[model samples]
Target: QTIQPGTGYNNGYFYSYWNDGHGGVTYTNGPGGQFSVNWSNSGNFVGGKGWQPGTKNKVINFSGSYNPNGNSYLSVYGWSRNPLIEYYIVENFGTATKLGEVTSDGSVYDIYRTQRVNQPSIIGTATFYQYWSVRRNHRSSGSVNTANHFNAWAQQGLTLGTMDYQIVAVEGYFSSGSASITVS
Candidate 1:
């Protein structure tokens, strides 16, 4: 069935709001738009037992607005007891793909930097390098070294080695660690 705005809980799906103003869970269909939560499923709410409600057991008046945070979605709330699990699926249609795991230890920020290398020595030598740096800003100070910075670049498909130019000074800074990668 097509999901239209204001469809409410009758459209074969419903949302639940925890003690807080945020939506805790969402129930949708299996094939079409009809699905039932089975509590018998073995597993804890947070540990295992995939989130299942029970047979014909639906969450009442559960509704929430979609909070778009870049490529991720979140449910905003004022207060709650049984914390809700913020789940997200890869932006693929057909088969569901697992991207990566997210931790709640601290805030996450991703900064991407790209540089184009143009060399006069090599014929038609134009290479572009993109680097993604993730900074975890916590409440306290932490140490970051060159190894950590290099690893972050490598994870983004950058190979280590030397360019046709001479080596120079490099520099970078965060709340805790500072580093730099420069070449002449």
Candidate 2:
């Protein structure tokens, strides 16, 4: 339908979508909490559903079908403000660092922390912390018990700031991918 790619709500769920403007990417935020995202030969594409002013440590439930050709992640992606933090509960990913592991929603997630230096962030270009909870095994659908990851990060001394926008997203970088997702 050629709708502009950006932020808004569909079926009462908030979405943050971005793509390197080109025909290689296309998406649809359909009714009934269903959305489809597709991208190919693109530098980057990210989109999904959740809350705008996301809560800290809320259990998020979601399910989806995914087909990723290269570097991509199906994750609970979000940001924070006071201390500037970006976080990910990655159900499936290409790769990341290793810190420790925490069990949540019947799975163990390996946690990691990375520092972004002068990178584009929710609050403009700035330095920030990127916290991660990468699942050991790949999965397309499930519930993310976020409190467990938050508490585990605290134990590792990774404190978070005020809550910001959060979404269960499908992201691809210098690659190709697609998904049909739902968040509740």
Candidate 3:
């Protein structure tokens, strides 16, 4: 099992291990005080230190800082609002070269979201940049869609970088669906 910080109370976050029979713990500090949710052996949680009534929740940005003890990295996940589906690009540091692309799935009202974490081995010396593009599919459906991609190059050795280093990116889209999503 592994652990990582959450993006917002229930926005976008990263998962350590993507598999069954694995679970971890998550902590939150709201008006109800600090609380934790322990995943069960089935890799699930039912109820926990429940939230206090009338507690106004605020979004927290958990971008940088990876926990070695937890063997985990931060992450973000969500959908894009672009009407037309095209491509998303993530580049290394200051370069204009594209490092990754979000594959297009044919759907006029196409909506996609992802819960991805940075590969600790790829946390390079320099920062990375991400660019997104939205375009018409030109297909008969004339469907609109959105996508996201990321890239990174780690610094020498396994040494952790400064706190300013962004271990994760927290930018995603809004979706209209009934699907339930979870990110580590």
lDDT of each: 0.23, 0.83, 0.22
State which candidate, 2 or 3, has the greater TM-score: 2
Q: Highest lDDT among the candidates is held by which one?
A: 2
Candidate 1 local lDDT, 21-50, one digit each (tens):
122222232332222221121121110111
What is the alpha-carbon lDDT for the whole of candidate 2? 0.83
* TM-score ranking from best candidate downward: 2, 1, 3
* Clash count of each predicted structure: 11, 0, 12
Ranking by lDDT: 2, 1, 3
Tens digit of lDDT per residue, candidate 3, span 1-184?
A: 1134422232222222222223443333223212223232223211111111111121222212121222121122111111111112121111033222234333121122222333111232322322232222322111112111221111111111221212112111111111111111
